[PDB]
Design an enzyme around this catalytic site. Structure first.
Site, PDB file in Angstrom:
ATOM      1  CG  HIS A  95      26.750  32.819  12.139  1.00 42.83           C
ATOM      2  ND1 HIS A  95      26.336  32.442  13.509  1.00 42.83           N
ATOM      3  CD2 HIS A  95      26.700  34.144  11.973  1.00 42.83           C
ATOM      4  CE1 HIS A  95      25.863  33.560  14.182  1.00 42.83           C
ATOM      5  NE2 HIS A  95      25.948  34.444  12.951  1.00 42.83           N
TER       6      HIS A  95
ATOM      7  CG  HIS B 228      24.365  34.396   7.595  1.00 39.63           C
ATOM      8  ND1 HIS B 228      23.300  35.255   7.940  1.00 39.63           N
ATOM      9  CD2 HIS B 228      25.616  34.940   7.823  1.00 39.63           C
ATOM     10  CE1 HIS B 228      23.907  36.215   8.512  1.00 39.63           C
ATOM     11  NE2 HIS B 228      25.198  36.281   8.630  1.00 39.63           N
TER      12      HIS B 228
HETATM   13 MG   LIG Z   1      29.304  37.522  12.194  1.00 48.15          MG
HETATM   14 ZN   LIG Z   2      26.382  37.491   9.757  1.00 44.95          ZN
END
Ligand SMILES: [Mg+2]
Ligand SMILES: [Zn+2]
Ligand SMILES: O=C(Nc1ccn2nc(-c3ccccc3)nc2c1)c1ccnc(Cl)c1
Length: 313
Positions: free
Chosen positions: A68, A72
């Site tokens: 994350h 991303h």
């Molecule tokens: Mg999310």
């Molecule tokens: Zn995401």
């Protein structure tokens, strides 16, 4: 004004394809995003000085977590770009502006932990936002960055257009809470099949944009096998760290987050493709036919996980 971004030839061609990988050169990702805004939106959509300052503050507010992270954010923005370019006439000028920004911003200040882990930890964000905890935080952080001096990329919008765009971004970012995806898709599935789906009904558009957001957010499963397989390592590195933190709170994590249960990952990927990803891209394809390549790539990767289980890799 006359200042395009231009990519090398392989990137200029491959960036148009759903399965494009943005590559390991972090320093190219901002220009790749500006490139996509310019082609998707126009060279006039944003003041380049303000956009660049917005992009770099967004990057700074993504953390160094395995999955994350800033890569991303840009990956999810690129899948939205591909959906918008293959559906030219279906989306308003405001929607094209809002959604690329929503995708870049959708996981701002993610810590690598689920809404469940925040609730069991009793994290302060779980008291502030009882549902879609991280997602309400990501929208909050987006508004914060928009209000830094010099960072308001929407300043040349009318007052009401500004309100519509922040509302497009808020719904888009909330929709990335996978807890909401199941009900959203069931409703879209019923509406498409009974023929009630109406893209001029705002509540219907909202639903369709929500599914797009799920599709872009899950797009790691729509890449070529070697990208998908290697991204899975980053996904599980976060999950297993969360599992570790559950055990520290005296809570057996679900198997998905228990590093002791690596052996069960292939079957767990199958479940996920069957219960989440395939249904997502199927309903998306019914609503927006030019997004069929995402479904096709997803099916190819389901078949690669099936091969993993049969000991053929
Ligand atoms: Mg999310
Ligand atoms: Zn995401
Ligand atoms: O992989 C993703 N999600 C899942 C969902 C359910 N399970 N269950 C297992 C599982 C593993 C071992 C044993 C039993 C179960 N593995 C997964 C992985 C994912 C999430 C967010 N974004 C993307 Cl692109 C992909």
């Amino acid at each position: 004004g006359l200042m395009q971004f231009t990519l090398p030839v392989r990137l200029c061609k491959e960036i148009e394809l759903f399965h494009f990988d943005i590559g390991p050169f972090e320093n190219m990702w901002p220009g790749i995003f500006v490139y996509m805004v310019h082609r998707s939106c126009g060279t006039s959509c944003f003041e380049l000085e303000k956009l660049c300052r917005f992009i770099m503050s967004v990057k700074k507010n993504y953390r160094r977590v395995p999955y994350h992270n800033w890569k991303h954010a840009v990956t999810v923005a690129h899948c939205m770009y591909a959906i918008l370019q293959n559906n030219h006439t279906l989306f308003t000028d405001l929607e094209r502006k809002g959604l690329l920004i929503a995708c870049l911003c959708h996981d701002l200040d993610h810590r690598g932990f689920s809404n469940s882990y925040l609730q069991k930890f009793d994290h302060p964000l779980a008291a502030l936002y009882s549902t879609s905890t991280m997602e309400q935080h990501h929208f909050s952080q987006t508004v914060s960055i928009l209000q830094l001096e010099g960072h308001n990329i929407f300043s040349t919008l009318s007052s009401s257009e500004y309100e519509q765009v922040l509302e497009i971004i808020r719904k888009a970012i909330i929709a990335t809470d996978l807890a909401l995806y199941f009900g959203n898709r069931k409703q879209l599935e019923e509406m498409y099949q009974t023929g009630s789906l109406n893209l001029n009904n705002q509540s219907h558009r909202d639903r369709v944009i929500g599914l797009m957001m799920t599709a872009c957010d899950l797009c790691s499963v729509t890449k070529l096998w070697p990208v998908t397989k290697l991204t899975a390592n980053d996904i599980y590195a976060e999950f297993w760290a969360e599992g570790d933190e559950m055990k520290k709170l005296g809570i057996q994590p679900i198997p998905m987050m228990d590093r002791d249960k690596k052996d069960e990952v292939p079957q767990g990927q199958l479940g996920f493709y069957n219960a989440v990803a395939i249904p997502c891209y199927t309903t998306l394809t019914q609503i927006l036919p030019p997004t069929e390549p995402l479904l096709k790539a997803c099916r190819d990767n389901l078949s690669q996980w099936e091969k993993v289980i049969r000991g053929e890799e």
